[PDB]
Amino acid sequence: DSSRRKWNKTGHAVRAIGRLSSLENVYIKADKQKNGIKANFKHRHNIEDGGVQLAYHYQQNTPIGDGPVLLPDNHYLSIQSKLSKDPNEKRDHMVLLEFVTAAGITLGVSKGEELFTGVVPILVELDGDVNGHKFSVSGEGEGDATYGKLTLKFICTTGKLPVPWPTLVTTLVLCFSRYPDHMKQHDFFKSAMPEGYIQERTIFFKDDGNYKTRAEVKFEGDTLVNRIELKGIDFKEDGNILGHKLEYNTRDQLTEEQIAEFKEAFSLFDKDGDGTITTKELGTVMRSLGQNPTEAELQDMINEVDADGDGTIDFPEFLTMMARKMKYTDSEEEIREAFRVFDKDGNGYISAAELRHVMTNLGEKLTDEEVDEMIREADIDGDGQVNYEEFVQMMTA
Ligand SMILES: [Ca+2]
Ligand SMILES: [Ca+2]
Ligand SMILES: [Ca+2]
Ligand SMILES: [Ca+2]
Ligand code: NA
């Protein structure tokens, strides 16, 4: 419709500012005390019946040998994962496809790099204990660091896995990231090879238990091996983990129709129509929505999604970030933040006088009739206003 596709335009623009304002990548820092790196990241797991389970990761990497290593400046890795099932497999199993790419240093090789120039066989061995429920996982596949590509099949060798597969993905080889030519001096992971590194994590599942991991990642001959011990404590008997309430698969399906909604939202930011979004342009939309960021914040927000590191959001970089932002569910707190962009008085209801103060402050002419058509489209209980539960309907597939 002509008032339906005025929701998507305004809604996508807000979800996009949401994405630009959060921290979704794997942030790496030098740790000179340990001759190593530290990392941290927020992972999302879709809850089958709706909502999201967050898993907050802290990470530490330590060389096994005394060789010199590369200690990087601050960057991040960007990871895209697809989970699938092997149709001829009786055993509890996971087929995993990962792409891993290093970015985050805008445009201004160790001996280990050389072991990754081609396709490297991969072996993974995990022993686990969560709340006393013990399990082992075996995996095999191969990695191509040229393209940051990993393929792996994993078996549960103990029978039924006591936790959902998706919760083990982060634990079950960042030495296969594609690093740009300008960032090769920052690849610690390959630098440690072949003697290897210790990778330790702690993973906090919000409102539930935590995992502790210790892994040896090294060459055993010509194979890259990941040997992992995992311990989980304090999990709820009927939480999302132990009660197996998380989506396995997470559809990867952007319709032609959705891409086109992304473009219309994109064009709100790209006011000069040159196919990219500058700090100036991002700033302009955000001031117009109340917020008032610095040049420094805008550079950081753009850096979160700047694949090519040119200091702008290219249309493709935008399509990518919006794709991700539809694959994984937002938190209540994130949707709340979205709502408050419309809900200026904080009373918990979007008036028709609130929707306009957004729309005519975002450079849109519209009669006090098409406004009322917007409200009507979203308003189920009929009060002529938009409450939180109503908003949450507008902001979904
Ligand atoms: Ca532009
Ligand atoms: Ca760019
Ligand atoms: Ca209000
Ligand atoms: Ca209502
Ligand atoms: Na163990």
UniProtKB/Swiss-Prot annotation:
Belongs to the GFP family. InterPro entries: GFP, GFP-related, Green_fluorescent_prot. The keyword Transmembrane helix does not apply. It comes from Aequorea victoria (Water jellyfish). Changing residue 52 to A: In mut2.1; shifts fluorescence lifetime from 3.03 to 2.50 ns. Changing residue 210 to T: In EBFP1.2; shifts the excitation and emission spectra to shorter wavelengths and increases quantum yields compared to BFP. Changing residue 147 to N: In EBFP1.2; shifts the excitation and emission spectra to shorter wavelengths and increases quantum yields compared to BFP. Energy-transfer acceptor. Its role is to transduce the blue chemiluminescence of the protein aequorin into green fluorescent light by energy transfer. Fluoresces in vivo upon receiving energy from the Ca(2+)-activated photoprotein aequorin. Changing residue 100 to R: In Azurite; shifts the excitation and emission spectra to shorter wavelengths and increases quantum yields compared to BFP. Keywords: Chromophore, Luminescence, Photoprotein. Pfam families: GFP (PF01353). This is Green fluorescent protein. Monomer. Changing residue 173 to N: In R10-3; matures to the red-emitting state with excitation and emission maxima at 555 and 585 nm, respectively. Changing residue 138 to R: In mut1.28; shifts fluorescence lifetime from 3.03 to 2.76 ns. In mut2.2; shifts fluorescence lifetime from 3.03 to 1.94 ns. In mut3.3; shifts fluorescence lifetime from 3.03 to 1.88 ns. Photocytes. Contains a chromophore consisting of modified amino acid residues. Maturation of the chromophore requires nothing other than molecular oxygen. Changing residue 185 to R: In Azurite; shifts the excitation and emission spectra to shorter wavelengths and increases quantum yields compared to BFP. Changing residue 154 to L: In mut3.3; shifts fluorescence lifetime from 3.03 to 1.88 ns. In R10-3; matures to the red-emitting state with excitation and emission maxima at 555 and 585 nm, respectively. One of its GO terms (biological process) is generation of precursor metabolites and energy. Green fluorescent protein has been engineered to produce a vast number of variously colored mutants, fusion proteins, and biosensors. Further generation of mutants led to more stable proteins (at 37 degrees Celsius for example) with brighter fluorescence and longer fluorescence lifetimes.
